């Protein structure tokens, strides 16, 4: 149903706040997001710039995916992220995580036309 590209802006997109608001970010948004619709995703890391600066990351450094796919690249920039870990007490579908803020390099994999990204790699 949902494209590659559809599924990167829900799992990974947040351009509404420049970091996570608050301890309660990640418990909001990996529910808003349907990210614990089935289960408690174990990790998940949202990306705060705006969507026209993270589809330029598939411009920018090329580099091998953990895969070992070729078509993943850094960003040039540091980015505002946010990193959504759950924890020890979590019980489905009472998902609960732990928020980490950090600004740091995104690795994306790009797929399309327009070229966007479609995986996220990871972050340095
Ligand atoms: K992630």
């Given at each position: ?5 559809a ?16 301890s309660?970010?990640?418990n ?9 619709k089935?289960?408690?995703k ?5 990306v ?36 959504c ?7 489905y ?27 996220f790699?990871?972050?340095?």
């Open positions: 149903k949902e494209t590659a590209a599924k990167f802006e829900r799992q990974h997109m947040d351009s509404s706040t420049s970091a996570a608001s608050s309660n970010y990640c909001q948004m990996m529910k808003s997001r349907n990210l614990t089935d289960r408690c174990p990790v998940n890391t949202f705060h710039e705006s969507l026209a600066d993270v589809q330029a990351v598939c411009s920018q450094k090329n580099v091998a995916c953990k895969n070992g796919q070729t078509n993943c690249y850094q960003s040039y920039s540091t980015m505002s992220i946010t990193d870990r759950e924890t020890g007490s979590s019980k579908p009472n998902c609960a995580y732990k928020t980490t803020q950090a600004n740091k390099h995104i690795i994306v994999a790009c797929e399309g036309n327009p070229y966007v990204p479609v995986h790699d990871a972050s340095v």
